[PDB]
């Protein structure tokens, strides 16, 4: 007696800290209870903070996500007179682009592609979505597997401001931050294929 919703887009993550929030408005905007499940609908994800995979608030937290975690995950949103079961596929890849081209990012989904506008003052964004329990330090930026060092490049919060965007700014970017959780530190590294439009 629960309405099943199957999500068409899979979520890709490198083998590192990862989190997914059960945000499905307006279904999750009322007075509801959110419960995550891994390839199951009978045993909920543990809430033990020291567990590698656990539920934190309305989020599923992987510290880190590892090979074998790929599958269908369900968020059961229970209201007073309603029940919804959201099925989302979460896929992990083992390798990072700067270490090797093998067994890494399986496809260039929108969460791994960005665009910079030619001749304009534009910026890149580092997408780090984690619950409050995870504290993210400053972000280091890389282009073509080397640290970015330049006059036109400035770091500001989660963005990399790029002034006077040139056609030579195309390439593979990487943003890296240290994530702290329960006194323990983890490293998050996201790649971006950056293209330029005039």
């Amino acid at each position: 007696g629960c309405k099943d919703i199957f999500m068409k887009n899979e979520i890709l993550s490198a083998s590192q800290p990862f989190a997914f929030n059960c945000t499905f408005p307006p279904i999750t905007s009322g007075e509801v209870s959110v419960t995550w499940y891994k390839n199951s609908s009978k045993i909920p994800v543990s809430k033990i903070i020291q567990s590698r995979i656990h539920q934190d608030e309305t989020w599923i937290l992987f510290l880190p996500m590892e090979w074998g975690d790929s599958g269908v995950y369900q968020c059961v949103i229970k209201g007073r007179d309603s029940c919804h079961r959201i099925h989302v596929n979460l896929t992990v890849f083992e390798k990072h682009w700067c270490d090797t081209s093998i067994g890494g990012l399986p496809n260039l989904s929108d969460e791994y592609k960005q665009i910079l506008h030619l001749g304009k003052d534009d910026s890149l964004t580092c997408h780090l979505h984690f619950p409050k329990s995870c504290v993210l330090g400053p972000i280091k930026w890389y282009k073509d597997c080397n640290e970015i060092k330049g006059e036109r490049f400035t770091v500001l919060e989660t963005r990399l401001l790029v002034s006077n965007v040139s056609a030579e700014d195309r390439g593979n970017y990487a943003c890296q931050a240290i994530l702290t959780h329960s006194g323990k530190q983890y490293e998050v590294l996201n790649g971006i294929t950056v293209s330029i439009t005039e």
Partner: antibody
């Protein structure tokens, strides 16, 4: 258009070394991994290794661990594959290929270079 | 090393017939890392099927790719003369990258 143009065929004496070039074009040279593939005559495909022109990181197949050296010249968008201490079974056609982020496959290949090890 | 066992080694069939070639991997290979290449004599290999079932640009609809885990297949629903070539399976999942020994498709006319 992404293109990989290799150097011409060569003949080298046993014990000698050979360097095959792969000039790239149609994309940003430092934003990709260049791979090398060996095709022995009458045989199929054997993967030799990869080089990232951005950070010059190389990863070789353990079979070519002490035989191959991969380098790049970013100024002329060219990858190089060098075989040392040549022997009969190094006679083969050698190909270069390029890989892009989020596309783990070989869509573009060079034309091949036949290396003959002969006295 | 993920060994790829490709079979048959040779296939001789008439035009309009169905061609089937399998590739058995020693360890499980994720579907996004399993590909097929077509190679005609004197030429470089050409990407044919990528991500197990996606057709590369210029690849006719009669070609179909399927599979998961350790078992993959390339199918030609109705052979045309231009299909005569050697085909190779390939895995991009774990180093070192490996290919199958090939299936040489000969056309009986």
């Amino acid at each position: 258009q992404v293109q990989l143009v290799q150097s011409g065929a060569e003949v080298k004496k046993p014990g000698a070394s050979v360097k095959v070039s792969c000039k790239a074009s149609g994309y940003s040279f430092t934003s990709s991994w260049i791979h090398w593939v060996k095709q022995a005559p009458g045989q199929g495909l054997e993967w030799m290794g990869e080089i990232n022109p951005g950070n010059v990181r190389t990863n070789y197949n353990e079979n070519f661990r002490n035989k191959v050296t991969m380098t790049v010249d970013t100024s002329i968008s060219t990858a190089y594959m060098e075989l040392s201490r040549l022997r009969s079974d190094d006679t083969a056609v050698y190909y270069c290929t390029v890989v892009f982020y989020g596309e783990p496959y070989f869509p573009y290949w060079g034309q091949g270079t036949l290396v003959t090890v002969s006295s | 090393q993920i060994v790829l066992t490709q079979s048959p080694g040779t296939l001789s069939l008439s035009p309009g017939e169905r061609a089937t070639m399998t590739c058995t991997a020693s360890s499980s290979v994720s579907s996004s890392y399993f590909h097929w290449y077509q190679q005609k004599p004197g030429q470089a290999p050409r990407l044919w099927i990528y991500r197990t079932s996606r057709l590369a640009s210029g690849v006719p609809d009669r070609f179909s790719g399927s599979g998961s885990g350790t078992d993959f297949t390339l199918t030609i629903s109705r052979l045309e003369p231009e299909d005569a070539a050697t085909y190779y399976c390939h895995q991009f999942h774990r180093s070192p990258l490996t290919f199958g020994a090939g299936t040489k498709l000969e056309i009986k006319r």
